[PDB]
PDB file of C-alpha atoms in Angstrom:
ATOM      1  CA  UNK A   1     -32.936   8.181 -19.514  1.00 53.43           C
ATOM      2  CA  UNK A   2     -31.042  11.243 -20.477  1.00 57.33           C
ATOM      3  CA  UNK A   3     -31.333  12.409 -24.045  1.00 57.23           C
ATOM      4  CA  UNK A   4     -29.113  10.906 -26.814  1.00 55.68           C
ATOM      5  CA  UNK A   5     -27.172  14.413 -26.778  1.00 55.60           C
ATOM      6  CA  UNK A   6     -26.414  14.658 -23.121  1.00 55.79           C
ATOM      7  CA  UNK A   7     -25.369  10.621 -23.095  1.00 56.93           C
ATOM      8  CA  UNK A   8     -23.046  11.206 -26.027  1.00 56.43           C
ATOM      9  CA  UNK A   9     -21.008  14.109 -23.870  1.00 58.55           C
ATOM     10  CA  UNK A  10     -21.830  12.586 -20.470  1.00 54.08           C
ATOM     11  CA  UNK A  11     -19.795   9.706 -21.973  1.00 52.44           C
ATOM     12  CA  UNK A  12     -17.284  11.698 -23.261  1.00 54.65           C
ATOM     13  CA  UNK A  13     -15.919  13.209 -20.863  1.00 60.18           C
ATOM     14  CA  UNK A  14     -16.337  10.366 -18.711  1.00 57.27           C
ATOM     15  CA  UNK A  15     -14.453   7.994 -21.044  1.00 58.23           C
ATOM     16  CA  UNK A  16     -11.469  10.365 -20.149  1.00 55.89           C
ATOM     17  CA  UNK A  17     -11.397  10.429 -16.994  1.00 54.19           C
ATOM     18  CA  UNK A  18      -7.712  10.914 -15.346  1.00 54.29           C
ATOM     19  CA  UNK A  19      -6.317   7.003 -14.083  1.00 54.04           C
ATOM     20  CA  UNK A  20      -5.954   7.638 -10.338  1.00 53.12           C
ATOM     21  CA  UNK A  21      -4.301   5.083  -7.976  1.00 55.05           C
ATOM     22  CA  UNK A  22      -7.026   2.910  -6.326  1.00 56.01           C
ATOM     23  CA  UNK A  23      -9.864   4.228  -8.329  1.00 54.29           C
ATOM     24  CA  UNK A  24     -12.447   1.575  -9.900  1.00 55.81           C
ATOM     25  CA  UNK A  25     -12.958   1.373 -13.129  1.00 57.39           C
ATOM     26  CA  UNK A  26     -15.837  -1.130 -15.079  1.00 54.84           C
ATOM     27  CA  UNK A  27     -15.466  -3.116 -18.592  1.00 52.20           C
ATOM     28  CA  UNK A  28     -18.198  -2.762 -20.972  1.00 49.92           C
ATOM     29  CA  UNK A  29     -18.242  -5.149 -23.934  1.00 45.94           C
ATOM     30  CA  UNK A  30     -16.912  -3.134 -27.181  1.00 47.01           C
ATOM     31  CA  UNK A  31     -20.126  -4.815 -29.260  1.00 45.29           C
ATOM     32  CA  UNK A  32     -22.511  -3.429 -27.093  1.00 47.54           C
ATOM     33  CA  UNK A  33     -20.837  -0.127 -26.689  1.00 46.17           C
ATOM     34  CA  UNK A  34     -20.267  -0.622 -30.205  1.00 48.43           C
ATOM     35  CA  UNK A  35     -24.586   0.199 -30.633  1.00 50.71           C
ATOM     36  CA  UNK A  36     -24.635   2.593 -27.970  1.00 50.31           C
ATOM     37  CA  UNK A  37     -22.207   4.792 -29.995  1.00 52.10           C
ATOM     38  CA  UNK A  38     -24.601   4.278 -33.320  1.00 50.60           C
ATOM     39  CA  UNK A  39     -27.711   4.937 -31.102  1.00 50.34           C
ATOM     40  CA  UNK A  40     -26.406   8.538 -29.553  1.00 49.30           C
ATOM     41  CA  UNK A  41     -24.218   9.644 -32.320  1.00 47.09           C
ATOM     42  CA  UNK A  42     -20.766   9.237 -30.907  1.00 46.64           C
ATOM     43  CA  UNK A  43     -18.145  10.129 -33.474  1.00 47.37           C
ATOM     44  CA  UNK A  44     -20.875   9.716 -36.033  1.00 49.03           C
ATOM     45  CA  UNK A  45     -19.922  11.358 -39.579  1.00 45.73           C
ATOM     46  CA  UNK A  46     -24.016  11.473 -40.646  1.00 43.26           C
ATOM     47  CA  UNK A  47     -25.554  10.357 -37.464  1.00 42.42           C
ATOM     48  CA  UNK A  48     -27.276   8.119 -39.749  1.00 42.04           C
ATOM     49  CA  UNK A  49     -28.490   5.644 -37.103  1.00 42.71           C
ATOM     50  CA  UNK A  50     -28.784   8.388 -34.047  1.00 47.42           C
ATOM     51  CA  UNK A  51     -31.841   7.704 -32.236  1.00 47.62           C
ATOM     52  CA  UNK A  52     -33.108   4.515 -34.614  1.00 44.51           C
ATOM     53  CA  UNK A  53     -34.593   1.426 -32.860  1.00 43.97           C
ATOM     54  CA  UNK A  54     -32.495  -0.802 -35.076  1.00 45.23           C
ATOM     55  CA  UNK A  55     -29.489  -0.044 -32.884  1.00 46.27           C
ATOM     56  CA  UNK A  56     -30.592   1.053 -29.533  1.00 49.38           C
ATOM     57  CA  UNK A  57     -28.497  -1.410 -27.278  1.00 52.33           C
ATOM     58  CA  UNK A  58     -30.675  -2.522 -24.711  1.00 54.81           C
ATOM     59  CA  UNK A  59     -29.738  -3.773 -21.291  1.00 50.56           C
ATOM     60  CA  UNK A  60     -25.718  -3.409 -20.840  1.00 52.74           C
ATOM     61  CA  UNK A  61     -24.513  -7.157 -21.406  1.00 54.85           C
ATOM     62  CA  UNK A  62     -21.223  -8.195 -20.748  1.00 54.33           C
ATOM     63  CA  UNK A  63     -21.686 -12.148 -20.875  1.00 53.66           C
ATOM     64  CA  UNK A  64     -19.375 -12.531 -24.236  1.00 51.82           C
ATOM     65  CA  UNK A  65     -16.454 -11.166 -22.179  1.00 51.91           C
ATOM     66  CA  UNK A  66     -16.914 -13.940 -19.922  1.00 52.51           C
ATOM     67  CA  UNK A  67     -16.422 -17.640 -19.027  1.00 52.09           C
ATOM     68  CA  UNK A  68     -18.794 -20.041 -18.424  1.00 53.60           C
ATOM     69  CA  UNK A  69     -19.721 -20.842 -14.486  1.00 54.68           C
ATOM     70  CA  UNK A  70     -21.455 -18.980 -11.595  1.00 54.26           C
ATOM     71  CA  UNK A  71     -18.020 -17.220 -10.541  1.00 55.48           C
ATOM     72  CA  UNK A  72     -17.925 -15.639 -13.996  1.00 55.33           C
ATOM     73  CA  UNK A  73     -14.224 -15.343 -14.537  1.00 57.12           C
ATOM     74  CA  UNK A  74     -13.503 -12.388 -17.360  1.00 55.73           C
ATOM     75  CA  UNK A  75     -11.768 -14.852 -20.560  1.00 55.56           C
ATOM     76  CA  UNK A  76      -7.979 -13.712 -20.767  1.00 58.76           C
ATOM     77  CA  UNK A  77      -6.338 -12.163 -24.046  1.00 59.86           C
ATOM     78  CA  UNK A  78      -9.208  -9.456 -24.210  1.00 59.60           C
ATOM     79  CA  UNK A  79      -7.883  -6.288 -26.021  1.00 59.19           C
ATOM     80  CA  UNK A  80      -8.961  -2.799 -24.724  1.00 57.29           C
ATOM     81  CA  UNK A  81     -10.575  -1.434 -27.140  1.00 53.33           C
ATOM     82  CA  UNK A  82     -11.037  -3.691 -29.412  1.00 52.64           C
ATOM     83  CA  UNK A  83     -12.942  -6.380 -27.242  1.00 51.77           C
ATOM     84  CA  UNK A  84     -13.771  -4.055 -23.975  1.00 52.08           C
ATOM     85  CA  UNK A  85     -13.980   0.043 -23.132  1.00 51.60           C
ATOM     86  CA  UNK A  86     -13.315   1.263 -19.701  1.00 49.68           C
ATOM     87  CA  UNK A  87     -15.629   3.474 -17.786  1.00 47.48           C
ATOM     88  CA  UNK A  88     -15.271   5.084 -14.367  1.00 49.04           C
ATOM     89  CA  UNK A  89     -17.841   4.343 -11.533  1.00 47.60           C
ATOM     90  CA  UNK A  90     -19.752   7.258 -12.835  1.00 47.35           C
ATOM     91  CA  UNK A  91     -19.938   6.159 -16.258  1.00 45.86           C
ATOM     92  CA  UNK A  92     -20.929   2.481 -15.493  1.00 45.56           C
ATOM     93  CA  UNK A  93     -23.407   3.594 -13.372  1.00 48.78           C
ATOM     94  CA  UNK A  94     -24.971   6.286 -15.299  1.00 45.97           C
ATOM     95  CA  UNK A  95     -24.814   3.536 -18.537  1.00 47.16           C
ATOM     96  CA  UNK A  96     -26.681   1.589 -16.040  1.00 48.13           C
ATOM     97  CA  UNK A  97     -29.245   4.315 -15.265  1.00 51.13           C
ATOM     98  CA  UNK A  98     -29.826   4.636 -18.761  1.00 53.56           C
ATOM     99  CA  UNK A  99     -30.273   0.897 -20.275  1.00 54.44           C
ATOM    100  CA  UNK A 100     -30.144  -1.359 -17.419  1.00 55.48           C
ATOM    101  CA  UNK A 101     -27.426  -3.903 -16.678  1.00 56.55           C
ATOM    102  CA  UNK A 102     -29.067  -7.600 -18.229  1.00 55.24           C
ATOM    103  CA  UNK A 103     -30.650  -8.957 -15.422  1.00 55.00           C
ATOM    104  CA  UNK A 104     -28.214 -11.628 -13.078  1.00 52.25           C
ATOM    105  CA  UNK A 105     -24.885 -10.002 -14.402  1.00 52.95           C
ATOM    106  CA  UNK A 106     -22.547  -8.407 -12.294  1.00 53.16           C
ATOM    107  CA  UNK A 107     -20.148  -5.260 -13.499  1.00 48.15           C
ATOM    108  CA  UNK A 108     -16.882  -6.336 -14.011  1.00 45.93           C
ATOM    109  CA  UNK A 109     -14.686  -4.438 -12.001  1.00 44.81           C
ATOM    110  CA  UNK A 110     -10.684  -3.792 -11.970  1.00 46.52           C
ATOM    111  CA  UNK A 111      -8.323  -1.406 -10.218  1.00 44.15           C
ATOM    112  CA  UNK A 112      -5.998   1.407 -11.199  1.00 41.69           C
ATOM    113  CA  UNK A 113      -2.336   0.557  -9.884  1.00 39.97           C
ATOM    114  CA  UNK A 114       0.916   2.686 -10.827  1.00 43.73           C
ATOM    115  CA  UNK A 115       2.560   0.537 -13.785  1.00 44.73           C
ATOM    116  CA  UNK A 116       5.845   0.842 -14.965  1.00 44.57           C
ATOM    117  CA  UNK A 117       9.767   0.309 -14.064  1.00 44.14           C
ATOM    118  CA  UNK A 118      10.329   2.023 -11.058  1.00 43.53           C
ATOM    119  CA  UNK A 119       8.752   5.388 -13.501  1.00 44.00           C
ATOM    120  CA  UNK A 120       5.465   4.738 -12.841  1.00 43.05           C
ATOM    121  CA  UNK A 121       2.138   5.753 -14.800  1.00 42.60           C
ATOM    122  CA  UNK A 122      -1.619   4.719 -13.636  1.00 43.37           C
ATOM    123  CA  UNK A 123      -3.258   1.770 -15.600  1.00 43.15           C
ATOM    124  CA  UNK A 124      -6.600   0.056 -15.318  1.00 41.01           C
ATOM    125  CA  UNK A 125      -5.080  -3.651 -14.140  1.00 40.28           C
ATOM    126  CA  UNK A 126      -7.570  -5.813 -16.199  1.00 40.11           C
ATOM    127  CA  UNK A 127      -5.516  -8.922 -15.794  1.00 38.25           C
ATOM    128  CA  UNK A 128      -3.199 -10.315 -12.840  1.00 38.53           C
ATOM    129  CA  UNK A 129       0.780 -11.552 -13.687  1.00 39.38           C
ATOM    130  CA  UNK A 130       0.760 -14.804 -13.020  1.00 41.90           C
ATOM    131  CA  UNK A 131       4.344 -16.348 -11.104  1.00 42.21           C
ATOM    132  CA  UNK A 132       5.753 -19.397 -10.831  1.00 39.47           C
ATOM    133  CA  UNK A 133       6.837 -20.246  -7.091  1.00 39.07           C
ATOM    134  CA  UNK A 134       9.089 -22.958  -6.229  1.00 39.39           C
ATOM    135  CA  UNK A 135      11.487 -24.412  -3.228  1.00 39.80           C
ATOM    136  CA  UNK A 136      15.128 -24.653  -4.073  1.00 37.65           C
ATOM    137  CA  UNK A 137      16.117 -28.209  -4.361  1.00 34.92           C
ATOM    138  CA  UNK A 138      12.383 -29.477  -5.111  1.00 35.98           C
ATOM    139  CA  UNK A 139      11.713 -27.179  -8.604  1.00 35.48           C
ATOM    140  CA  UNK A 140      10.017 -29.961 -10.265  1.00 33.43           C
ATOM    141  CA  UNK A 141       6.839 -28.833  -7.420  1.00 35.35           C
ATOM    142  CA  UNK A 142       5.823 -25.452  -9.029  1.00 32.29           C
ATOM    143  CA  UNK A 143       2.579 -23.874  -7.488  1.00 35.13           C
ATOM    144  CA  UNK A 144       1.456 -20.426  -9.321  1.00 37.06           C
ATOM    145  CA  UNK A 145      -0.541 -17.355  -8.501  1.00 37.93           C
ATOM    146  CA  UNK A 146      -1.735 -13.969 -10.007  1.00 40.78           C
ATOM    147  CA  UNK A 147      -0.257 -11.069  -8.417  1.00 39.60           C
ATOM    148  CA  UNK A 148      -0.729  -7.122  -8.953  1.00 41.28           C
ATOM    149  CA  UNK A 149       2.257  -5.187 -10.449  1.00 43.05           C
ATOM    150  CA  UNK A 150       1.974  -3.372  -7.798  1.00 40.19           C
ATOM    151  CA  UNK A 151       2.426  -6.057  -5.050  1.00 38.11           C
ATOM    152  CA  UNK A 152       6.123  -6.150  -3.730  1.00 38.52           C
ATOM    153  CA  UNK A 153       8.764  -8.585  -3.441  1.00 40.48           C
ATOM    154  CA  UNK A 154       7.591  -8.524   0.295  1.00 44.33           C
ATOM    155  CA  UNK A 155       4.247  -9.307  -0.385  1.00 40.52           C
ATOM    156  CA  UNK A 156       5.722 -12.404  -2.812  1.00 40.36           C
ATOM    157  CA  UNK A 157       7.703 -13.999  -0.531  1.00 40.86           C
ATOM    158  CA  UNK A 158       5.696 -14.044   2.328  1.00 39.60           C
ATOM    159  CA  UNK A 159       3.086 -16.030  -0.296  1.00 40.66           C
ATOM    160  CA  UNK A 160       5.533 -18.243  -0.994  1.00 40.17           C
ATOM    161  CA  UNK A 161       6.630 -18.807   2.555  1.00 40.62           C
ATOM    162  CA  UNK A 162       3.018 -19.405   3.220  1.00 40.78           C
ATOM    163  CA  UNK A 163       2.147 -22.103   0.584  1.00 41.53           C
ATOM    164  CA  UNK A 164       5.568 -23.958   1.450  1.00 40.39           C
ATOM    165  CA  UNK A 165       5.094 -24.107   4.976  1.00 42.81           C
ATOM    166  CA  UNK A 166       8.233 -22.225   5.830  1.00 37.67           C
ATOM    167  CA  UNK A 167       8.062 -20.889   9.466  1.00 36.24           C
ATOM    168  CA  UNK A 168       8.267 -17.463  10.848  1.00 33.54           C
ATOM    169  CA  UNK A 169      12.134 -18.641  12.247  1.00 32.15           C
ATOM    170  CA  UNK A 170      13.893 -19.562   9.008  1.00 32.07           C
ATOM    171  CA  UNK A 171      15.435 -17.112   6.727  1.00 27.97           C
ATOM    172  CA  UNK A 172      15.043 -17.375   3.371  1.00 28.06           C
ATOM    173  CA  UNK A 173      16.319 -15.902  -0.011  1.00 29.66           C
ATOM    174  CA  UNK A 174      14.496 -15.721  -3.032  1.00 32.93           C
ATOM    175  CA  UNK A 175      15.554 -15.882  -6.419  1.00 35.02           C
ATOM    176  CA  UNK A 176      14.323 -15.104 -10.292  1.00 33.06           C
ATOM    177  CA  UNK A 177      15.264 -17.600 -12.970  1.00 31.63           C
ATOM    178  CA  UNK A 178      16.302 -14.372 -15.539  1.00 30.69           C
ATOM    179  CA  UNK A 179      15.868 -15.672 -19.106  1.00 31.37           C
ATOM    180  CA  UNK A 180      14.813 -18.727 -18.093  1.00 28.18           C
ATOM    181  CA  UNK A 181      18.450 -19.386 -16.939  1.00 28.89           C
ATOM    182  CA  UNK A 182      20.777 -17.173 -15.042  1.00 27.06           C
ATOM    183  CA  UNK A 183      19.950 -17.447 -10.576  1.00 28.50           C
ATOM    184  CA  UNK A 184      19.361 -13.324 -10.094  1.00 26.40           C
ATOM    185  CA  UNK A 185      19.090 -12.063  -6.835  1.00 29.11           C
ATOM    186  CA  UNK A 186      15.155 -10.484  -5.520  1.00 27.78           C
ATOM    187  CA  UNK A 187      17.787  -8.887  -2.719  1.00 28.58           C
ATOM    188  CA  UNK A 188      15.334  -5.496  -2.792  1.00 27.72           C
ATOM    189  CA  UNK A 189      12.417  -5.983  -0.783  1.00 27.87           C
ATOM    190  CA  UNK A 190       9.860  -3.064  -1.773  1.00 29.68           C
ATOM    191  CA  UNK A 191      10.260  -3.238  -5.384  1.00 30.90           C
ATOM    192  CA  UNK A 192       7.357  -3.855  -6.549  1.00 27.82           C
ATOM    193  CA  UNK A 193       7.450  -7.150  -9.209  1.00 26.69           C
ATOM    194  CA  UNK A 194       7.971  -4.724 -12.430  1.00 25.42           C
ATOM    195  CA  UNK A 195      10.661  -2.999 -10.723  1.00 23.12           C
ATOM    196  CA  UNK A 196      11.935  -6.184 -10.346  1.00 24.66           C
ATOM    197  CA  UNK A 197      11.106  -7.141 -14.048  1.00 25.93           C
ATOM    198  CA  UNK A 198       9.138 -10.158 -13.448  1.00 23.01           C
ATOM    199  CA  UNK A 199       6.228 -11.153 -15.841  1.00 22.35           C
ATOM    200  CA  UNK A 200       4.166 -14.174 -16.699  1.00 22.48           C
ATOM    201  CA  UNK A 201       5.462 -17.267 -16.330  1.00 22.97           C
ATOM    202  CA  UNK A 202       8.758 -16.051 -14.210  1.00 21.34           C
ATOM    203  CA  UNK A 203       9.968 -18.968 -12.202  1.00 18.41           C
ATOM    204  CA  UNK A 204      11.221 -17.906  -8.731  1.00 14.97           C
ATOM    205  CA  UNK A 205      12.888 -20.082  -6.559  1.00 14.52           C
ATOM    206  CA  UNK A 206      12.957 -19.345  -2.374  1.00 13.10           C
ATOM    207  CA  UNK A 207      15.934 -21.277  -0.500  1.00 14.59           C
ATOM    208  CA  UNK A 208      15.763 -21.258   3.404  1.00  8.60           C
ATOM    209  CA  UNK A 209      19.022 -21.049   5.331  1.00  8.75           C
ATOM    210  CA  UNK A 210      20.562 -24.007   6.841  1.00 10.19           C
ATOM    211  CA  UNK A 211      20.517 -24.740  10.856  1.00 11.02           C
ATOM    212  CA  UNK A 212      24.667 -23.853  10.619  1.00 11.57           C
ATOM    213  CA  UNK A 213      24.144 -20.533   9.420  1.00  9.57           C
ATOM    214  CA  UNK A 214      25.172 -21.386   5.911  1.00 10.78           C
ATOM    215  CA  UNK A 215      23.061 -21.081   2.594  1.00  9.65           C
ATOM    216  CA  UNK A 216      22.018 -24.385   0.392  1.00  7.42           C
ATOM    217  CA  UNK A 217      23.622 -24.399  -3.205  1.00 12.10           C
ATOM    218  CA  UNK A 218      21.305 -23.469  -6.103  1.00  9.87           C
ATOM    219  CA  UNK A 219      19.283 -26.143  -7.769  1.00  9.76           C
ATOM    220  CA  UNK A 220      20.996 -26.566 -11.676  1.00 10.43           C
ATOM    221  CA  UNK A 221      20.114 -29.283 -14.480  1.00 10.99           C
ATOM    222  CA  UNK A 222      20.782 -30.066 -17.927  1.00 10.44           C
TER     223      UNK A 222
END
């Protein structure tokens, strides 16, 4: 492995790394980064533990950020920082050079994507935005999925047109549920679904125009 100085800088620098659309970043468990810092030094005030066996970290594990099963889902409400860093490829795989990732693990990738409404800034997307997706007239049936804020309100509707089984021939319109109450037009096709202002647990609704041309009434209830 490289020396405890050259680790501690290699790091460094690495850890700030410029967000770049696309680019691949890895999450490594805070409490094992947590020794790694003790071991080299890192923003150490006596360096009191630099080099000392007690807290060399050993092979990179990243099971306690994870749920049970062979899939190995990552657990939601993790806090950067606090629960998880983020490296670039060339930081996970030089902390892999150096320590090993525990044997049957796999890194735990995410993606940059632009963030933000319509003024955009890159951010490492640890966890989806999950929608609700419904049919007009039959919002009772509510199917979700996890979508990137980067994913447009293209992209949405053709998901929902696909899980509903609406063909190529229809025309549909879909709508958010703003506030949880107010029908507000998704008339704007590339927004993406923060332009749009949609975030967990938004219920959209798609209605498909009628044979005579005309549009179906939106669903309301007490």
């Amino acid at each position: 492995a490289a020396d405890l100085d050259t680790q501690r800088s290699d790091i460094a620098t690495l850890l700030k790394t410029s967000l770049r659309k696309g680019d691949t970043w890895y999450l490594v468990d805070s409490r094992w980064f947590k020794q790694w810092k003790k071991y080299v030094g890192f923003d150490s005030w006596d360096k009191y533990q630099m080099g000392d066996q007690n807290v060399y970290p050993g092979p990179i594990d990243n099971s306690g950020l994870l749920k049970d099963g062979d899939a190995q889902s990552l657990k939601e409400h993790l806090i950067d920082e606090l629960d998880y860093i983020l490296l670039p490829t060339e930081g996970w795989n030089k902390l892999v050079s150096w320590y090993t990732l525990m044997e049957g693990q796999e890194p735990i990738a995410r993606k940059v994507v632009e963030q933000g409404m319509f003024v955009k800034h890159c951010k490492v997307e640890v966890y989806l935005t999950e929608l609700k997706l419904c049919e007009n007239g039959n919002m009772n049936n509510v199917v979700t999925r996890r979508f990137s804020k980067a994913d447009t309100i293209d992209t949405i509707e053709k998901e929902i047109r696909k899980i509903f089984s609406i063909p190529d021939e229809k025309e549909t319109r879909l709508w958010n549920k703003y506030m949880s109450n107010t029908f507000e037009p998704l008339n704007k096709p590339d927004s993406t679904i923060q332009d749009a202002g949609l975030y967990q647990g938004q219920v959209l609704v798609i209605e498909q125009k009628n044979e005579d041309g005309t549009w179906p009434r939106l669903e309301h209830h007490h």
